[PDB]
């Protein structure tokens, strides 16, 4: 159905001014939004205006949208409002460093898709919902949550005074929603592996062409994964703290499986905390390093994301060796 923000919430956002010392900070890939909670809605407005312009969206409509988007996130340990803004910030840094490669419609679509990508998340994986016949898995067979997140995105845009894309042409509005839809779906990690493998082959053979739409869609997809997994690109102390949140949500899912007499995978088992550093080595080796390596090849200015991920891989290797 989607929840609406209050008049007080959106009007408070309209008046927000980002402190000048942070304008330079937000441009960095390693930027951590963590210590500026009150500013997160305002940080998103700032990023939208810098990337798309102050004339791109009607200020009141944009403020209503952000605040209603904020309300439609649940108070789960990881897949919350904080994660939405963190993923949107990383997209802003990628877009800013590759400005002319993407259209005005892609830049507005991607930043919106990133803030909306995990809308109404329940703290449960797709496999869990499918295994326990949850109504969301009956409605959406594959990429269960991701289809629900896009359904929630459309629902918020269809609220009163929330359609931030109304001023686009009928063809452009259709285009923007398709951009948002493919971007949200791409955040399903199960789709990433095949997507990155296709991109690798295209890059190595020299057949990758950003003029080709299917290629573009695949590049956008990898950008989505790269933003979604960005906690691995922060400074070590931030990366550790976000892992705690990721695991707290995983262990609660594992607890639900145990209550139903099902042993969860070690990742979702709170009695298997000792296995985490090896699980992180495996995740960096087969997921994060390949992701950021392919991203840096396609978009060389995204190199600092790979550099930070490689530093965090080094820290996890240091944990294993007994140097933590
Ligand atoms: C703690 C870093 N991390 N670690 C793991 C293991 C993971 C597994 C599936 C989806 C996302 C993640 C992830 O972000
Ligand atoms: Mg998700
Ligand atoms: Zn996410």
Swiss-Prot record:
List of residues binding 3',5'-cyclic GMP: 79, 280
Location in the cell: Cytoplasm, Cytosol
Active site: 79 (proton donor)
Residues the entry annotates as binding a divalent metal cation 2: 118
Annotated positions binding a divalent metal cation 1: 83, 117-118, 228
Positions with a binding annotation for 3',5'-cyclic AMP: 79, 280
PDEase domain residues: 6-323
Tissue specificity statement from the Swiss-Prot or TrEMBL entry: Abundant in the putamen and caudate nucleus regions of brain and testis, moderately expressed in the thyroid gland, pituitary gland, thalamus and cerebellum.
Transmembrane segments: none
Notes concerning its domains: The tandem GAF domains bind cAMP, and regulate enzyme activity. The binding of cAMP stimulates enzyme activity.
Subunit description: Homodimer.
Record: disease: Dyskinesia, limb and orofacial, infantile-onset: An autosomal recessive, early-onset hyperkinetic movement disorder characterized by axial hypotonia, dyskinesia of the limbs and trunk, orofacial dyskinesia, drooling, and dysarthria. The severity of the hyperkinesis is variable.
Known function: Plays a role in signal transduction by regulating the intracellular concentration of cyclic nucleotides. Can hydrolyze both cAMP and cGMP, but has higher affinity for cAMP and is more efficient with cAMP as substrate. May play a critical role in regulating cAMP and cGMP levels in the striatum, a region of the brain that contributes to the control of movement and cognition.
Family, similarity comment: Belongs to the cyclic nucleotide phosphodiesterase family.
Name of the protein in question: cAMP and cAMP-inhibited cGMP 3',5'-cyclic phosphodiesterase 10A
Organism: Homo sapiens (Human)
């Amino acid at each position: 159905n989607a929840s609406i923000c209050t008049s007080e919430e959106w009007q408070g956002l309209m008046q927000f001014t980002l402190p000048v010392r942070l304008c330079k900070e937000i441009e960095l890939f390693h930027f951590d939004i963590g210590p500026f909670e009150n500013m997160w809605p305002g940080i998103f407005v700032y990023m939208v205006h810098r990337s798309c312009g102050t004339s791109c969206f009607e200020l009141e409509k944009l403020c209503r949208f952000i605040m209603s988007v904020k309300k439609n996130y649940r108070r789960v340990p990881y897949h919350n409002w904080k994660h939405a803004v963190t993923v949107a910030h990383c997209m802003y840094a990628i877009l800013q460093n590759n400005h002319t490669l993407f259209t005005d419609l892609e830049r507005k679509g991607l930043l919106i898709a990133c803030l909306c990508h995990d809308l109404d998340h329940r703290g449960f994986s797709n496999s869990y919902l499918q295994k326990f016949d949850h109504p969301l898995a009956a409605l959406y067979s594959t990429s269960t949550m991701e289809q629900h997140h896009f359904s929630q995105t459309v629902s918020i845009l269809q609220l009163e005074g929330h359609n931030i894309f109304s001023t686009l042409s009928s063809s452009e509005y259709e285009q923007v929603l398709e951009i948002i839809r493919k971007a949200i779906i791409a955040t399903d990690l199960a789709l990433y592996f095949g997507n990155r493998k296709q991109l690798e082959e295209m890059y190595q053979t020299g057949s990758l062409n950003l003029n080709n739409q299917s290629h573009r869609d695949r590049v956008i997809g990898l950008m989505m994964t790269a933003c979604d997994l960005c906690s691995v690109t922060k400074l070590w102390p931030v990366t550790k703290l976000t892992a705690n949140d990721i695991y707290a949500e995983f262990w609660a899912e594992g607890d639900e499986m145990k209550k139903l007499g099902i042993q969860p995978i070690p990742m979702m088992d709170r009695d298997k905390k000792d296995e985490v550093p090896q699980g992180q080595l495996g995740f960096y080796n087969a997921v994060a390093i390949p992701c950021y390596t392919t991203l840096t090849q396609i978009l060389p200015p995204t190199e600092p994301l790979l550099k930070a991920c490689r530093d965090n891989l080094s820290q996890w290797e240091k944990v294993i060796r007994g140097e933590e």
